[PDB]
Design a protein around this ligand. Structure first.
Ligand SMILES: [Mg+2]
Ligand SMILES: [Mg+2]
Lengths: 96, 96
């Protein structure tokens, strides 16, 4: 089945999730933040919907998407179980 | 170019990164933790290498991989910039 963290981590999908934090929005309005087409953004939103991260609603000529807390909680759980302590310890070893 | 968070988030790659926290390991030894073939695991390790998350070394008949802190620091930075406050607030709205 779809893993929420794998799906969400795609960089356009990350940005779509951030954009939706300001509330439910139309496909066309979200799509205006990217060089990619409406159709491209629509397909990313369908993938996020299948993963349980966003939820669609239709009202007339607009399709709206909003974040689903249920999916976000599973996303955060997957990242928390992935990111074990030694990974934080290694990050602290990094130079720049 | 490769985004470390997108690459790392693939579920086999997440587990390979966790496994490597116990130290540098051979391809065959890592591969023994999964139903997938050596060849499959080898290819995931090549992707992680290209993303700067792991580093290869050859000694005789073994190829060894180890975590690269430089890549892990960028991975953690990408997740931290993605996961904005409102996402934590929404996770707290989730039921179960
Ligand atoms: Mg809601
Ligand atoms: Mg090292």
């Amino acid at each position: 089945v779809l893993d929420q963290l794998e799906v969400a981590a795609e960089p356009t999908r990350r940005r779509l999730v951030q954009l939706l934090t300001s509330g439910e929005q139309t496909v066309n309005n979200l799509a205006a933040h990217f060089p990619a087409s409406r159709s491209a953004i629509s397909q990313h939103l369908r993938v996020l919907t299948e993963a349980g991260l966003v939820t669609p609603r239709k009202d007339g000529r607009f399709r709206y998407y909003r974040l689903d807390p249920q999916g976000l909680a599973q996303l955060r759980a997957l990242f928390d179980s992935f990111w074990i302590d030694e990974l934080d310890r290694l990050v602290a070893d990094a130079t720049e």
